[PDB]
Chains A and B, each alone.
Chain A
Amino acid sequence: EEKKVCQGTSNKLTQLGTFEDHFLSLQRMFNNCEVVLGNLEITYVQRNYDLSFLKTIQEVAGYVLIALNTVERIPLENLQIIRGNMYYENSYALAVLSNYDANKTGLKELPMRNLQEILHGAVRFSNNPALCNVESIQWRDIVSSDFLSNMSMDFQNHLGSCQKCDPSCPNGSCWGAGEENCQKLTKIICAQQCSGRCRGKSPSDCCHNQCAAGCTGPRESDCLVCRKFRDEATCKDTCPPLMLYNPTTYQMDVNPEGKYSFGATCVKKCPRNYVVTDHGSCVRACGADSYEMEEDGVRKCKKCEGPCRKVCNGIGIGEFKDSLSINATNIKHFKNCTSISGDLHILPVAFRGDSFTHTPPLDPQELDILKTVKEITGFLLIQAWPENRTDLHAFENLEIIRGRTKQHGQFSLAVVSLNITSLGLRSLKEISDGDVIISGNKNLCYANTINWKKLFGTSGQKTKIISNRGENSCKATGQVCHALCSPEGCWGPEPRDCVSCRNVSRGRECVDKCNLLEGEPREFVENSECIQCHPECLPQAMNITCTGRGPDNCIQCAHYIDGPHCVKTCPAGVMGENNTLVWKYADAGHVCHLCHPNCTYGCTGPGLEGCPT
């Protein structure tokens, strides 16, 4: 059956407004909810507030937190499972804490008579002076053995005005008064023969591996709850794959019966406002290592190129208002920042420290934070640099300087009075606006080689490169451009320091050749770039190894041949057309061939022979 869903919350112990607002928002979120995709957090609920709406809840994907409540009763009567996909305080799937007041009254009853399963995580019970019956509970039937060591159970009252468990309860374990509140056991009472859950002690009374909490029968269609996924009326280990193996083309085709995973549910399409992930799941929003893109009308998550784009403020604007430089205190805020909205100042006051503003000296190791910066909206002004660093190392990934705002309203790039030997600006591709000043850098040797008119966006942009190391002494001491650089100049001596190469390149480096016939990792040429061959291409003597990327572009396979592909191993267990697995074996010539159709688990050779039997 398809259930009513809700997001859940992640407020931990945070209060939202007054006790009334907090309640109203708790109610708005969980009212009529059957399955919580996130966490169920019930906090700050005052005496006499009605929590009857909680009766509808039956599944919680994350954790359950019940803290600082004053209500006598929390009717979570139908909660069957807590999946523990997320923990509270690094270890708990269930945490019931400090549910009392000044008089030592509070939560008396938490009748969780249907809670039979806690897939992951431990249970914490702390400081609930009014709580009844829960101390009787046998958590060994509820919680996975891996977590019994991490349990945190503290129970205490006076007599706490508690009713005893019904005589009919096993080992006297109950959730409250009455026989309906007895602990139903489905793990500890099982036969030794049983894999997981059971509906009784007998071998007949045994649940399908795919069941969670309990079952009504022994099929994967008879589970109370699905241990992993529910595809319509059945519990399955995974959803029908989105892609399937086509034995004819050897190509992975889109599965017409393919299903996306939404929570612990298998869906043909993600619900409205949900994003598709790189693993078949429906998600509310993309991760930290990924951005969203509405490719083919469907919103999708794509792992972002390098570090994910973070546009953040320059010196003098946001947090950085009234700050004179990138300094010991502020440098932390520049963390994974890729774009700077405004200017960047690196002045002597940073390295020396400032009494008046309580800024200690900057530790030169901290400058490595700036390696993520690829774009500067304003200008870059460097009047101080650690004397032991030969380069502007921190700015090695800086691609563009915009010059929207300029130093003294003129310069977009100001590099002044430093011990640097080279401008380590190998990524600098554009100076959109503003002038460029490079002066007083006594040891600076390469500035003069660059074709600044290439970098410059407009004409009118000028350079003031003077008072550096003598251009003759640079030449005289070999401090010139690598022979592989184009006449377009360099940022330093290394072949990675060129503006452009005269021939080929491997990565950021200008090279004399690509590994076409001789190299360590074999390569092909695309747009004067040495691109590696797939690892499955067998290197060739006196001939090219590959004609492009992938295992479909090898001259010869290194391990196995699966039609047009070179494979490290033959396809085994990949899903094919009409819900039947593809299993292949390798012959004497290393060629992958389909297993006999009766080899539902895989084979070592042809026919029923290489198949036990």
Chain B
Amino acid sequence: DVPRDLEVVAATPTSLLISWDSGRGSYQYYRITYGETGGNSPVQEFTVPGPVHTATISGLKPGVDYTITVYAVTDHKPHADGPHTYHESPISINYRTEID
């Protein structure tokens, strides 16, 4: 049910502290993807637990334009043999890393 306010809250030439609001919604987890807006090489990804709304993206290249996407993910069933509920609600921002 739509996450919002994806934002870089703190940064160094090679790291970003990203933050978002889950809102009136509950997700099992978040899929974070990042890559140079360019970008030739594919996006890097990691998963953040549903209850956490903050993330550290490390090992970035300074002076590069990055696209950061957060997919809030619904992935449940009421039982092992139950109907699967699977949905992804994405939010994204563009951020340029600072010179060293």
Interface residue ranges, A against B (CB under 8 Å): 9, 11, 13-17, 21, 25, 44, 67-68, 97-98, 100-102, 126-127
Contact in complex: A13, B75 (CB < 8 Å): yes
Contact in complex: A15, B75 (CB < 8 Å): yes
Contact in complex: A14, B77 (CB < 8 Å): yes
B30 to chain A, nearest CB (A): 9
Query: Which chain A residues border B78 with CB–CB below 8 Å?
Result: 16-17
Of chain A, the residue at the smallest CB distance from B55 is: A127
Q: Write 19 A-B pairs (CB below 8 A) sorted by A numbering.
A: A11-B77, A13-B28, A14-B76, A15-B75, A16-B76, A16-B78, A16-B80, A16-B82, A17-B76, A21-B79, A25-B80, A68-B28, A68-B29, A98-B48, A100-B49, A102-B51, A126-B47, A127-B46, A127-B47
Query: Which chain A residues border B75 with CB–CB below 8 Å?
Result: 13-15
Contact in complex: B80, A67 (CB < 8 Å): no
> In this complex, which of B46, B73, B86 has the most chain A Cβ atoms within 10 angstroms of its Cβ?
B46
Contact in complex: B48, A127 (CB < 8 Å): yes
Contact in complex: B29, A13 (CB < 8 Å): yes
Of chain A, the residue at the smallest CB distance from B28 is: A15
- Contact residues of B between 32 and 76, Cβ < 8 Å to A: 46-52, 73, 75-76
B84 within 8 A of A: yes
Query: Which chain A residues border B79 with CB–CB below 8 Å?
Result: 16-17, 21, 25
A16 CA / B82 CA spacing, docked (Å):
9
Of chain B, the residue at the smallest CB distance from A28 is: B80
Contact in complex: A16, B48 (CB < 8 Å): no
A67 CA / B49 CA spacing, docked (Å):
9
Of chain A, the residue at the smallest CB distance from B74 is: A15
From the candidates A13, A21, A97, A101, name the one contacting B51 in the complex (CB within 8 A): A101
Contact in complex: B80, A102 (CB < 8 Å): no
B46 to chain A, nearest CB (A): 5
Interface residue ranges, B against A (CB under 8 Å): 28-29, 46-52, 73, 75-80, 82, 84, 86
Given contacts A14-B75, A14-B77, A17-B79, contact A101 B47 (CB under 8 A): no
Query: Which chain A residues border B46 with CB–CB below 8 Å?
Result: 97-98, 126-127
B63 to chain A, nearest CB (A): 24
Contact in complex: A16, B77 (CB < 8 Å): yes
Contact in complex: B80, A68 (CB < 8 Å): no
Closest 4 CB pairs of A and B: A15-B76, A98-B47, A15-B28, A14-B75
Query: Which chain A residues border B82 with CB–CB below 8 Å?
Result: 16
A44 CA / B80 CA spacing, docked (Å):
14
Given contacts A14-B84, A15-B28, A68-B28, contact A98 B49 (CB under 8 A): yes
Of chain A, the residue at the smallest CB distance from B47 is: A98
A143 to chain B, nearest CB (A): 22
Query: Which chain A residues border B80 with CB–CB below 8 Å?
Result: 9, 11, 16, 25
Contact in complex: B49, A101 (CB < 8 Å): yes
Contact in complex: A101, B52 (CB < 8 Å): yes
Query: Which chain B residues border A127 with CB–CB below 8 Å?
Result: 46-48
A146 to chain B, nearest CB (A): 22
Of chain A, the residue at the smallest CB distance from B85 is: A14
Of chain B, the residue at the smallest CB distance from A70 is: B49
A67 CA / B77 CA spacing, docked (Å):
17
Contact in complex: A102, B77 (CB < 8 Å): no
Of chain A, the residue at the smallest CB distance from B51 is: A102
B10 to chain A, nearest CB (A): 15
Query: Which chain A residues border B49 with CB–CB below 8 Å?
Result: 68, 98, 100-101
Query: Which chain B residues border A44 with CB–CB below 8 Å?
Result: 28
Contact in complex: A102, B47 (CB < 8 Å): no
Query: Which chain B residues border A11 with CB–CB below 8 Å?
Result: 77, 80
Of chain B, the residue at the smallest CB distance from A102 is: B52
A126 to chain B, nearest CB (A): 5
Of chain A, the residue at the smallest CB distance from B81 is: A16
A217 to chain B, nearest CB (A): 42
Query: Which chain B residues border A100 with CB–CB below 8 Å?
Result: 49, 52
A11 CA / B86 CA spacing, docked (Å):
12
A15 CA / B78 CA spacing, docked (Å):
8
A198 CA / B43 CA spacing, docked (Å):
41
A22 to chain B, nearest CB (A): 9
